[PDB]
Amino acid sequence: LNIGKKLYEGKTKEVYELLDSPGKVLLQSKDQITAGNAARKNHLEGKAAISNKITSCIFQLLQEAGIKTAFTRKCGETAFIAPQCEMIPIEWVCRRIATGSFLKRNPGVKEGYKFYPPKVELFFKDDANNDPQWSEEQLIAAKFCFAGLLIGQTEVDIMSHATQAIFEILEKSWLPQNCTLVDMKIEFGVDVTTKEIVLADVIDNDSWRLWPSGDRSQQKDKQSYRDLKEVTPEGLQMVKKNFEWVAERVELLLKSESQCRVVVLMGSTSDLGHCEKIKKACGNFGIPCELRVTSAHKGPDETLRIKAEYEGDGIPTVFVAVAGRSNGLGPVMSGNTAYPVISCPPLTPDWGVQDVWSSLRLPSGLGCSTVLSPEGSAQFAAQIFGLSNHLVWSKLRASILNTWISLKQADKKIRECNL
Template identity: 55%
Template sequence: MIPLEWVARRVATGSFLKRNPGVQEGYWFDPAKLEIFYKDDENNDPQWSEEQVIAQGITASGVTVKRPEVDLMKRVTVLVFEALEKAWDLKQCALIDMKVEFGVTAEGELVLADVIDNDSWRVWPAGDKRLQLDKQFYRDLDAVTDDALTKLKENYAKVAGIVKSFTTPVKGRAVILMGSKADNAYATAIQDACSNLGVPAIKRVSSAHKTTDTTLDIIAQYKSDRVPTVFIAVAGRSNGLGPVTAGNTTFPVINAPPLNDTWSSQDIWSSLRMPSGLGCTTVIGAEEAALAAAKILSLVDHMIFGRLLVQQLKSFVTVMKADAAMEKDNDLKIVSPFARKYSVANLNGH
């Protein structure tokens, strides 16, 4: 374990107010406020800056905590907080703050290594501190009575029930409309990319030019069941499918034309230059189409929202590892004359 506690805060309350006099309770942090505390019971877990963490040279399982490790812990802390915040928000509860810790595996991998439960966060139903459901209720008691303990147990049972409902089936879907069966391979790639993000995707075939009435009937099928839906129009050559769909539904419509090297420069304009009043968007590539659909659906679905956060984290880690590998390969060392270290004596002398 790395002896650090990472705290993410959305609202100023509790110990933060004591350490930061002048800040009013309820101050809203956007982005979330991050704080680091060194685990030292004898000194009441002092707050540390990122610079103190790096300068300390903490080592766990052979890994020394440096700037990349600090950056990764920051990002994971925010990811976990935002994912849980979204889940709580959909239950009409505000996640006020949260604490997590990290560790390093025997293989040298930095991981979140903590239990996240009702002792780790503050949760206020409807954002009302008086209704708090977490351990802070117990800490704030003037006297521990049987009635207070009963209330505490009720709070914990309620939180357990809510948290159990966090894992839910996805609420939305993507409907991939193909202009012809020839687009099936590309549509399947979009469907697979949607699946990776937890978005159910349905494939349909209908030509807006040749079978207009059928296209309108298919669109109408997805209006009545109240499932949040994003249409992805896959049509090569002249794209009439996207505009017709967008003009006959209030659901978002994404054009994802299957471009090729022969006519791409001409065909793309039928997806970009839309008639007014449609609000149709265009992306290039199967993964981009799936991502665009997932981001729209994440507004109403915390499961998809969490998957998007994880994908962004994976992208960050990939770039971070590539940079670390590149840094090792750099043989040229240029030392700036301003980079030399001064001793305390030298500084006093100047």
Template identity: 55%
Template sequence: MADYKLGKLINEGKTKKIYELLNDATLCLLKSKDRITAGDGVRSHDLEGKAEISTSTTVKVFRLLNQAGVKTAYVKSADPKCFIAKKCDMVPIEWVTRRLATGSFLKRHPGVPECYRFNPPLQETFYKDDANHDPQWSDQQIISAGFEIGGIKITKDEVDIMKRMTLVVFEILERAWTVRDSALIDMKIEFGIDSDGEILVADIIDSDSWRLWPSGDKKLMKDKQVYRNLATVTQQNLETIKRNFKWVEEQLDYVIEAPSPLVVIFMGSPSDEAYCQEIAKHATALGLNPQLRVCSAHKGTLDTVNILAEYEGSGENVVLIAVAGRSNGLGPVLSGNTVLPVINCPPLKSDNIERSVWSSLDVPSGLGCTTVVYPEAAALAAAQIHAMHNHLIWARLRAKQLANFLSLKRADSKLRKS
């Protein structure tokens, strides 16, 4: 925190304080408290060590989201109890996503069995109002409230954007927790609008924010519901809750990092290197590890098969991309000699596309190599294959889909307002 000078207290909640930073008006500092609460603050206890656990949990979650490409207010860690974030005007709505029916949903919807599965996940919104126990609001109520936050009026467009971002955040974290054999049952997040008028995932995401069941077993829950369920609260209960929260924080170490899976780009000629570098650029942006190799299925068949054997015997998950035009024997030869996925991406030119593409499309029977005609498409296809077993690649793809949605939504909104 030596680089930042604290200013006045901007806001104080039940479990955190927010301070302005004198040397950067666009940032703020969030400091967690050693405090646990439930029932809109009706139940409240000191819990030494919770602030550090909560901050570390939040930092790891936001790092994961930022790495995937979801825009958040998080900037960087400051000290064990604090982190720096973009200063936002907060939208007074809690955005809840549910995969399984439990908790308050069952009380509001009698007859629905516990663990009823929502596909797609169910989304609900609640107006932040402790005095009235955070009443549930519809989209129409949020739009009709006429909120103007950070100079932005909250219309249907903004509601649609926040709903889509909420869903993507949930799905990314749900997928990440499967790495630790834990089921993300439901969670809540909040949004803020920064000084540039951008909607960001903001506030804190920690064990107060979700229900998390290891092995999908409610009896093993590690979240704040354990505290809510207590008839009376003893010091021993509080120590158990702190151990649960610490377990969650530690498990996140295993999901915020993952090796970059390998994509090998075979080119039939050194003249195709620039085209292959374009594929590699897109692959790197998606979190893949591209390697370039030169070999000719026609002129050096044995060498091609020997190079292929290197990757088959590596024990790694590998996707192959074959870059060969005109008479493409490279992709089919690779596909005919491996069970690794093979993607053809011929370096087509305007004067040969109608002739050359057929050598990649019209392959012999029994071969499963697919064909795409753009470098980005080749990288995306490889990423989709790797995403089946790599949650971080899956997260980047989901965030890329979100970025496409946001781009179209904003362009449409701008056009309607012009």
């Protein structure tokens, strides 16, 4: 592990070059806590390890969801390796609940006002003037350029949208711990190699407000330190316990709270290719997916026996019925299970206009849905599992963001042919 020159030095972390690794850096956390732009600063033993653990869990969580993030791997108790970025000097805040500086800048608004959707604000990084709020108009007018990327309307719109998606994913991920994510701050950078804007710096207990059971008086974040009238060593021990409480629970955000399974039932092996597309698409959402062959018309006894094997082992299941021509498979399955059934018929333009009505017009007492896209049927099945599984939900949420970013990037490209 061949460390090079000190590239940047902050109040709680240092970034070093790696002579062994082109375009990667090491972020070393420090045993230091700070607040405000006066002399609130303190040595706190174990803080480097707590900070590094939290940002390492959180970045792994966001990266595995599909959020583009400056994170390679954890690297000992107190550092992590990241792709080298040029930092954008903006603090991006997202709020679910109005507290803190939102109340100061908006007198009359009360503690607890809820933002639907979550509110995004920008602060320019400058300690000298205590990080003043900026409009999007101010950020665009600054004509910032980092690793050769000019930060214009498109880039500002992307960091704004991503800030909201990242908040939403962290908010959903803390929920199973009975913790309310109130707000957070993040920073983005331009990856010097890819030129992509990515989540960067760190996310740790300085980055957010976390209320157990949504109770402010139980705050576990750095606000406990900000709020001390006087820093005593008894005060610093409470703040340390709060950091430890977060650190003891953060790894559980990477844990699945619910098992998920899709079972694709096909009436014929000639539909196998259509079924492989559903299975592959389920893999993108981290949902195990099984293929089976059964015909409602030639083997209805066996259809019900197979159904029962999946009903009976306790694993929450979505069935996808793939039957061409007169689809009896979705209907018979739909009528005989309390679990959801999705018909995804392998329609073609020859007879598809005729065949689809066998999936759509069903007798009463049948919940059976229809999704024509095979990738769509997996996505629908993911949306069902996302109601009870934060990891699936997070991949769906990040996927909304990434698709939207792709449109922005494609419109930016085509906009050039208009000059």
